Amino acid sequence: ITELDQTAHQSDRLNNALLMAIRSSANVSSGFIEQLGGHDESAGKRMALSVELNNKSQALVDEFVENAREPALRGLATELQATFAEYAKAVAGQREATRQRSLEQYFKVNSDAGNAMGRLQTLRQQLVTTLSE
Amino acid sequence: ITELDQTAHQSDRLNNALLMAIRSSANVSSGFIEQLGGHDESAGKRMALSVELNNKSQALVDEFVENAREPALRGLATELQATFAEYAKAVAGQREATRQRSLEQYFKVNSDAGNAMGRLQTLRQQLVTTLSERGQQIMLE
Ligand SMILES: O=C(O)[C@]1(O)C[C@@H](O)[C@H](O)[C@H](O)C1
Ligand SMILES: O=C(O)[C@]1(O)C[C@@H](O)[C@H](O)[C@H](O)C1
């Protein structure tokens, strides 16, 4: 019965990808504030942590899509993949605005980040209900 | 298969409570950034969404612990709600530090927030394994 656990094992991929992705972003925003108040060695560690969480969640998303090959999950998983990439792109945007110390640049891409994360939340619900079967 | 769907549901409540809880705090951090940049109206929407997401994640943790009753699961469940309480009030500290437009108080409670979340993440993993142990145990009849 690979049906029952490759499925439940797809939930570790999906959930940890999302948890790591939102922590990636949260660390950048925290880091930016840490840089504004002169906490620079601390902020550097939040930037490094955001980079590695982005790499580990991306790897999980790719493995999730590689394993959702039945016709039902197929399109939903690719839409997940494309929206996750959309979100990762915005968070790399947050990192670049932090390295440039630009409040305005941050405001530009933070809108993209919230919009993509709001969609990942609803996609998450559609994926756990589809996979619960 | 009655109890098995309940271990799946319990793992979903937990994973979604944490996701939304971290989203709640990220909204405060980026909303502070927007406010420093002069974007007070966007920041107001982030503040509101942060409260909404805290209310939802807090309802999911309360529901998780209500149905986490077996002894293998109760010890971790009460530590979760105690560690979640710590996170939710560090986030409330972030919101108040934003209220007072003060960088340095934000840094104090941000250390509390990351420290609570580190412990919360370990507690989540233990519950996920324990719930998946019960899951597999039921199928090993
Ligand atoms: O611990 C993390 O991963 C956070 O991502 C650290 C910090 O960026 C935030 O204040 C969040 O509350 C949690
Ligand atoms: O949508 C959210 O919940 C966020 O929490 C909104 C914004 O605060 C962030 O930049 C995150 O990347 C996503």
**How many Cβ atoms are within 10 Å of B129's Cβ, its own excluded?**
10
Of B133, B115, B139, B109, nearest in space to B29 by CA: B109
Ligand nearest to the CA of A18: 2
Residue linked to tokens 């399109």: A75
A133: which DSSP letter? -
Domain of residue B88: give its range: 2-139
Coil, strand or helix: which one is B100?
Answer: coil
- Report yes or no: A3 at the B interface, CB cutoff 8 Å: no
Chain B residues near residue A33 by CB distance under 8 angstroms: 29, 32-33, 103, 106-107, 110
Is A110 labelled a binding residue? yes
Of B110, B82, B115, B116, nearest in space to B96 by CA: B110
Q: Can you give the CATH number for the domain in which B22 is found? A: 1.20.120
Task: Give the Å distance between the CA of A7 and the centre of ligand 1.
Answer: 29
Coil, strand or helix: which one is A37?
Answer: coil
Q: Are B19 and A23 inside 8 Å of each other by CB?
A: no
Q: Output the CA angle B72-B75-B80, nearest 5 degrees.
A: 120
Chain A residues near residue B39 by CB distance under 8 angstroms: 107
**Are A31 and A98 within 8 A, CB to CB?**
yes
Domain count, chain A: 1
Is A77 labelled a binding residue? no
Q: What is the dihedral of CA A51, A24, B64, A73, to 10 degrees?
A: -80
Chain B residues near residue A112 by CB distance under 8 angstroms: none
Could you give the CA distance from residue A113 to residue B55 in angstroms, rounded to a whole number?
A: 22
User: HSE of B4 in the Cβ direction (CA atoms, 13 Å)?
Assistant: 13
HEC sequence for A77-118:
HHHHHHHHHHHHHHHHHHHHHHHCCCHHHHHHHHHHHHHHHH
Could you give the CA distance from residue A63 to residue A11 in angstroms, rounded to a whole number?
A: 11
Q: Are A106 and B26 inside 8 Å of each other by CB?
A: no
Phi, psi of A4 (to 5 degrees): -75, -20
Q: Are A117 and B34 inside 8 Å of each other by CB?
A: no
- Report yes or no: A25 at the B interface, CB cutoff 8 Å: yes
**Are A133 and B5 within 8 A, CB to CB?**
no
List the residue whose alpha carbon is closest to atom 5 of ligand 1: A23
Biggest CA-to-CA distance, chain B: 61
> What would the two tokens of residue B19 be?
């996701």
Q: Which one of B29, B108, B117 makes the best mutation probe of the A interface by having the most chain A beta carbons within 10 Å?
A: B29
**How far, in Å, are A62, B44, B71 from residue B120 at the CA level?**
26, 28, 20
Could you give the CA distance from residue B87 to residue B21 in angstroms, rounded to a whole number?
A: 8
Is B57 labelled a binding residue? no
